[PDB]
Amino acid sequence: GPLGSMEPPLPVGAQPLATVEGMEMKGPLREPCALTLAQRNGQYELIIQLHEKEQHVQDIIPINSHFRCVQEAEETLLIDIASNSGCKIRVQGDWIRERRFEIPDEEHCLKFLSAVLAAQKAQS
């Protein structure tokens, strides 16, 4: 019913815990995107989707020490929700040097931040 006529863009094995629409900002320019948290193989992983004109690029960014989500701060992994209402976060790790992301949808931001925060909180 809720599923589309064709397999979803996200991995089949992946279990999208939460899905939200955000915007990826980069020094030279920005580009609309979407942040989706999913659990695969009993592990937590964050998938970043870019609304690229060509095709939705699938970026697999596993959640762990290498992956960090800082909410408008140098390193505020413990707290992220406190800064609701248009939340801006930054991701840095082996997969990517540094990229910015934002979610203007507060209601959606709560689920995204809560799910992602819980994932990192549980790991560390």
Domain 1-124 adopts which CATH fold? PH-domain like (2.30.29)
The single residue listed with the structure tokens 């989500």 is 69
The span from the CA of 107 to the CA of 122, in Å, is: 23
| Structure determination method | NMR
Distance CA 16, CA 32 (A): 20
What are the residue boundaries of the structural domains of the chain, listed by start?
1-124
Radius of gyration of the chain, Cα coordinates, nearest whole angstrom: 14
Concatenate the DSSP letters of all residues of 5-52 into one string. SS--SS-SS-EEEEEEEEEEEETTEEEEEEEEEEEETTEEEEEEEE--
Give all strands of the β-sheet with 99-103 in edge-to-edge order.
57-62, 43-50, 29-40, 15-26, 99-103, 87-92, 68-71
